[PDB]
Design a protein around this ligand. Structure first.
Ligand code: ILE
Lengths: 334, 336
């Protein structure tokens, strides 16, 4: 029961973008204490909120913008633009601030107000579109802006841009190195699908046998061929199959109910002291469901945790008060 | 010009407490581009929001609870208690969750309701006290519970606990290591003073000549012997000299005005893309003022950044919008 904190990094970073990646892989113990999850089975969570702006999208905003600059797709005098009301817009504002590019984020005026403030703090221009029109309204205005100003804008295009997927070759390498090649199964909740496919690509290059599991809301199970539907797992369930998705790289898809995802996240912060977001709740429950299968005994399971619960305080994540013991909570989840 | 992201940690952490510390030391560039700051001077920020709950206090809550467990001051059956409405509360809740101890946090019922929800998520019991009584009301209640329940509670006592100061021997080692011994000046905005003293204690062992600079609100300059007063630099300016403060380890104290601290933090996010909190605004401004002094040319200046601006969205930090170009903003901040 000796407990050592982290050693010095022994690096001086040249700017904040160099602190992106190399996120920690942490053992779960509290939510894994269940008679069906066997002793040898290892359940690890990769905590992407250790990134400078606390989400997986940091890797994406950075790679998209940096590659575009190296490529000549983004050049001085041009501006970045994207329709997004989430973590991607924040990641793009961070990259844009460092590189010295104006960043334009379009989103329905109904959204965030807090993420709006984050994006403005970074110096972003916000393009608040008509609330009723939702994200299609934001996309529409960006298209209108590109058309009216040819040559001026670089569109991030998070669902169609392969520099998204490619960023997660680093995510995969970290998993490989950190588990010393022992990883057996990776679980990733799917938004753009950059994580699941980019991780899958790279890991399957390392070891064909690795099982890759995508997670999506049961209420909007589009990867499994269902229709787009309302759901409350923020960050995932985009309602279409992203163009960067590659089904060949995904071995199984697990649908998780919105309410279960939230309830899992509540249990994780309570019993492991890890304050994960909503989509993490879904990924972790899927991973726990894998860990209880007899054919998975002794395997190493890695679960992506894309964001931190702090970004969800204005939501319903921590409203519901679950009852029963820990074993009771976990039984109702499984 | 090559930007390289971080390499794999090559470690599997047994639990989240093992990810505390080893925070990154990052160069500032955008906010250092002012004629009075010399090219050779290195201005670095140590980003304590890389801790798992996003503040320097993760170290403190961890070490307080860990040492108490190792010493026998915290034993199965007892509960943790503290009156705090800041980051220390969250740090204690995380430590408590992992070690398997109950955490009781007392604060005024009207303060940091975001932070309230964070704490309840970790399973903490909140002791919400009368709003208009503020922090002395929460302390009074904790004193009451302590008195009526002798032996039940372990009080963190962040302002008086040497385990707070001792945690920053790690902070100091990271600074020493990361700069390969080249650190010349450390700038730290003072709340409990755990950071500035614990860092000074350890670094002054390494090398004669490391200047240690404390930072406090201009409106409440108690370290400098002025009277307590109202200020808006959250996390610092406690209004008294903490029991763990040791003036002999501090070379200079810099007062910073609230509105300047905020304006600095706004400039840092906008021009360096680093979303630092209010007290970081204060420390960075003090550090840039140091970087201006001709005797400091070519020196390595390390500035502690205790928290991320995202924890401040409800405050006026980003509500006030600065007119003017980068150079006008920086010039207005170094004004005098
Ligand atoms: C001086 C105030 C301190 C730093 C703060 N209230 C905290 O405990 O987090």
């Amino acid at each position: 029961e000796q407990i050592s904190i982290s050693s010095p990094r022994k690096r001086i970073y040249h700017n904040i973008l160099e602190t992106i990646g190399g996120t920690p892989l942490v053992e779960l113990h509290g939510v894994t204490e269940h008679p069906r999850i066997k002793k040898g089975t290892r359940i690890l969570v990769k905590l992407e909120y250790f990134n400078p702006m606390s989400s997986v999208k940091d890797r994406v905003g950075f790679n998209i913008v940096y590659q575009a600059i190296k490529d000549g797709r983004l050049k001085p005098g041009m501006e970045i633009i994207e329709s997004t009301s989430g973590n991607t817009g924040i990641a793009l504002c961070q990259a844009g601030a460092v590189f010295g590019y104006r960043v334009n984020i379009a989103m329905p005026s109904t959204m965030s107000v807090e993420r709006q403030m984050i994006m403005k703090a970074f110096g972003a221009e916000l393009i608040l579109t008509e609330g009723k029109k939702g994200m299609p309204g934001a996309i529409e205005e960006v298209n209108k802006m590109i058309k009216e100003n040819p040559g001026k804008y670089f569109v991030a295009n998070q669902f169609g841009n392969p520099d998204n997927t490619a960023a997660h070759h680093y995510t995969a390498n970290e998993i490989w190195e950190d588990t010393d090649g022992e990883v057996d199964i990776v679980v990733s909740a799917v938004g753009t699908s950059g994580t699941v496919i980019g991780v899958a690509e790279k890991l399957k290059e390392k070891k064909k046998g690795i099982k890759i599991i995508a997670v999506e809301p049961e209420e909007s199970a589009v990867l499994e061929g269902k229709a787009k539907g309302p759901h409350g797992i923020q960050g995932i369930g985009a309602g279409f199959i992203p163009d960067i998705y590659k089904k060949e790289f995904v071995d199984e898809i697990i649908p998780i109910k919105t309410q279960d995802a939230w309830k899992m996240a509540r249990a994780v912060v309570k019993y492991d002291g890890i304050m994960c977001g909503m989509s993490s709740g879904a990924a972790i429950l899927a991973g726990l469901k894998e860990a209880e299968k007899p054919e998975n005994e002794g395997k190493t399971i890695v679960i992506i945790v894309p964001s931190c619960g702090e970004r969800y305080l204005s939501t319903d994540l921590y409203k519901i008060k679950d009852e029963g013991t820990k074993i009771q909570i976990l039984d109702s989840l499984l």
